[PDB]
Amino acid sequence: SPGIWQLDCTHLEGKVILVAVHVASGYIEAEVIPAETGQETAYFLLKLAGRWPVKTVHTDNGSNFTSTTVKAACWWAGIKQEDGIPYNPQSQGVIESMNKELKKIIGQVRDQAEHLKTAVQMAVFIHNHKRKGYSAGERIVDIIATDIQ
């Protein structure tokens, strides 16, 4: 559980926002890309796994699950690649809710940035710092620190 992440791909302004959510905390990292490809997904996962202890990734769709480039990145980084089938059905809804909420925040900051990528990183910041009490950033650190100990 400390090591479980979920990929999520959402669309805005004709572009793609690729998101990794740390399932137990709600903490996210995100990037804007022109389109979701295996190469983009592979690179994003490499970045993520260098920054946090990523043990398992629930991939967002079958194309990324199948991608030989994504499989290579997961092998390289020591990530177990799993499907993202919401056997637990409240998973879909939790992600749909996060996407709506991310887009809401993006809209709230959108006029402060010339470029979408900047607004997305502003939204990541706001999301990870928001107290709900702990923030997602606080929860992920506590979860992993408990695991190490």
Ligand X SMILES: NCCCC(=O)N[C@@H]1Cc2ccccc2[C@@H]1Cc1ccc2c(c1C(=O)O)OCO2
104 binds, among a second copy, ligand X, none (CB under 5 to 8 A by kind): none
At 138 the three-state DSSP class reads: helix
Instruction: Give me the residue label for tokens 């999520």.
Output: 8
User: How big is the chain by its Cα radius of gyration, in Å?
Assistant: 15
Q: How far is the CB of 124 from a second copy (least distance, A)?
A: 4
Q: Which residue, 100 or 129, has its beta carbon nearer to a second copy?
A: 129
Segment near ligand X (CB under 6 A), from 18-26, 35-43, 56-64, 139-147?
35-43
Cα separation of 78 and 17, whole Å? Answer: 24
| Contact between 108 and ligand X per CB under 6 A | no
By CB under 6 A, how many residues form the interface with ligand X?
14
Of residues 41-100, those binding ligand X (CB under 6 A): 42-43, 46, 69, 72-73, 76
Cβ burial 81-94 (10 Å sphere, 16+ → b, else e): beebeeeeeeeeeb
Cα separation of 48 and 88, whole Å? Answer: 25
Q: How far is the CB of 83 from a second copy (least distance, A)?
A: 24
142 binds, among a second copy, ligand X, none (CB under 5 to 8 A by kind): a second copy
Q: How does strand 15-22 pair with strand 80-82?
A: unpaired
137 binds, among a second copy, ligand X, none (CB under 5 to 8 A by kind): a second copy
Among 47, 73, 61, CA closest to 16: 61
90 binds, among a second copy, ligand X, none (CB under 5 to 8 A by kind): none
